[PDB]
Point group: C4
Chain length 79, copies 4
């Protein structure tokens, strides 16, 4: 990555490892080690992501925002 990983990884149903980092990013990583995508946030992602029934990744950041991100990496919504 590019920042310390204080976030705890969540594992998708397809096996994808979802984790945040204090480099302002959220990383989706395949089990083989290659990166699926990364979603840039406005602050350090200290929160551990959560996965719902639809596969949406819910993670908070140090920019007052709670990000909802689709499995493909596009932003669903943000609070």
């Amino acid at each position: 990555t590019g920042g310390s990983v204080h976030s705890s990884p969540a594992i998708g149903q397809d096996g994808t490892i979802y984790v945040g980092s204090n480099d302002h990013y959220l990383y989706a990583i395949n089990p083989n080690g290659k990166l699926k995508w990364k979603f840039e946030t406005g602050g350090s992602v200290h929160s551990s992501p959560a996965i719902g029934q639809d596969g949406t990744i819910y993670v908070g950041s140090n920019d007052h925002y709670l990000y909802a991100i689709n499995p493909n990496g596009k932003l669903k919504w943000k609070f």
Copy 2:
């Protein structure tokens, strides 16, 4: 929100995203992005909430308190 989200989101059985923030609040957010309710606490909510069989949300805060909150947003009890 109004504060950095160091808390990790818990996802309800109905799909509701439960998360805390260091703005002293606990947020219940629908999957569509709209807010269900928020419960104000006496300190920054750094702990990640937990959900039991009855749907009660258990989360700790930086005010020495462990809050138990019903799914509708009213306080069950606090330790």
Copy 3:
């Protein structure tokens, strides 16, 4: 409690809420709100407890120790 709750609560199979606090303690709390027991540790319990198949509560502390605690509150072992 007596200290800020940075630990995230784990919920037992009987419904018991297991959480730590930075007052050096680990708290087991019944869903009704009354306390089951508390196990004193040598440092602030910042880690979130985990529960295994036998009901043992595994939680780390800021005293270099990883505590294993039986459901009744007595120490199983510590690393």
Copy 4:
């Protein structure tokens, strides 16, 4: 251990307790209390490990790295 345990323990399917520590290590501990193995990292392991279907332990560290570790203790990959 040799450092404060800010990481939250993950419990394997065989019962093994996987946890990190700020002594730069990741600890795999049998339920009897004896250590299975430890994997040294380049920074304090503040993240809580996660376990996938294959039993791989995914944990982040304060050295910008996301470690993937096989159940036997050898490194799968790292990001």
